[PDB]
Amino acid sequence: PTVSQLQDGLEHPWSLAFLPAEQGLLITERPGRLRLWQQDKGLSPPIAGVPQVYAEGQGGLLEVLPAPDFAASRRVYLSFAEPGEGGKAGTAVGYGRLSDDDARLENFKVIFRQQPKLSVGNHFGGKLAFDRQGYLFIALGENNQRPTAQETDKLQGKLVRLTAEGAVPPDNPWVGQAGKRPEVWSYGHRNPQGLALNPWSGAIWEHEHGPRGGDELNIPLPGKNYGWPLATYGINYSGQPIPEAKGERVPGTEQPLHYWRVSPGLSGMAFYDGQRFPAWRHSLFIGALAQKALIRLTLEGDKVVAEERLLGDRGERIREVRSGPDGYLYLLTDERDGKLLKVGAS
Ligand SMILES: [Ca+2]
Question: Which residue numbers are catalytic?
Fold first, then answer.
């Protein structure tokens, strides 16, 4: 593949999002800054009005996602780790309006908070995605408290579906059910760092880290249990089993679409529906942090039929993957001197 380094000097960049036409790209730096990159103008100073964050461990400023109607509204959603009571943090999601001159995020306000707050630095999740109807999906980790992913009254280890304003859609699976959070779409997730709308089927797909082994790709269905920590393809970091695990397959829990017994460290995900590189059409691209590579899965409908590895000689932790309107892939690398990369098939 071809690789062009478009920008360096990004401190642990986490998310990118394209703005319309040639207006550029927004990029988050996990320590807590939002930037705008454009091909002629380079990288902006930090944009004003961004929330303060819990910038410890894996937390900080996470996803940036312009609203589907950004051209009209200039609305920009952000996810981030937010401090709370008792010195524990949790994920939060809000939005503001990017000013006409790109200098300031105006009137930022939180619309959703993970509760309770249980993290001391790990497993925020944080990816965001809109579906075809404009509903907002939010992927949440279990804050490193493994059993809470199974608990229906806790927002740990859940995929959440909200309206554009953060309200609960009345057809969410748990609405009206005692002891269950009505924001929840699916449960039993560990630490999801991939979330994307399949452009052909209209289904949200998700991926998540396993512990020592067992990273997973899922197609999450409403009200379904993805099994963490009762079911897993991984073990604990010590080499002992995860204490709560009953098996790789556990009845009443849904299997992953695809799994990796040796964890690449999945991060970022994009379906390729461009015209520039026809050989890449109907592929799903996923970053690998630990294995420092880009994964390409060939799809036949909902089936994964082949797995390819790219960029394995570059030595960069791939944190973010987006399919650009110009037909190239755009990546961020997770390092102190983090990079924005433009990647093509040849
Ligand atoms: Ca699972």
Answer: 123
Q: CA 271 to CA 198: how far, in whole Å?
A: 7
Asked whether 124 and 91 are in contact (CB, 8 A), the reply is yes
Type of residue found at 167 = A
Beta-bridged to residue 269, according to DSSP, are 286
Q: Find the DSSP H helices in the chain.
A: 70-73
> From CA 8, how far away is CA 6, in angstroms rounded?
7
Domain residues for 278?
1-346
Beta strands at 2-10 and 338-344: parallel, antiparallel or unpaired? antiparallel
What whole-number distance in Å separates Cα of residue 318 and Cα of residue 331?
7
What number of helices (H) and strands (E) belong to the chain?
1, 24
Specify the resolution in Å: 1.3
37-41 own/partner pairs: CB under 8 Å, 24+ apart:
37/6, 37/7, 37/340, 39/6
- Å from CA of 68 to ligand 1 middle: 30
Q: Residue 280, SS3?
A: helix
The tokens for 340 are 């924005």
* Residue 153 burial (CB count, 10 A): 12
Q: Is-contact 30 78, C-beta < 8 A?
A: no
What single-letter amino acid sits at 112? F
Q: How many domains does the chain have?
A: 1
Name the nearest CA neighbour of 55 among 141, 119, 137.
119
Q: Which two tokens stand for residue 305?
A: 């039929």
Residues in the chain: 346
How far, in Å, CA of 324 to CA of 166, rounded? 27
Which amino acid belongs to residue 80?
F
Q: Compute, in angstroms, the gap from residue 21 CA to the centroid of ligand 1.
A: 38
* CA pair distance 11, 74, nearest whole angstrom: 26
Tell me, in angstroms, the distance from the centre of ligand 1 to residue 188's CA: 7
- The strand pairing partners of 288, in sequence order, are 266, 293
Q: Which amino acid is at 64?
A: V
Please give the method by which this entry was determined.
X-ray
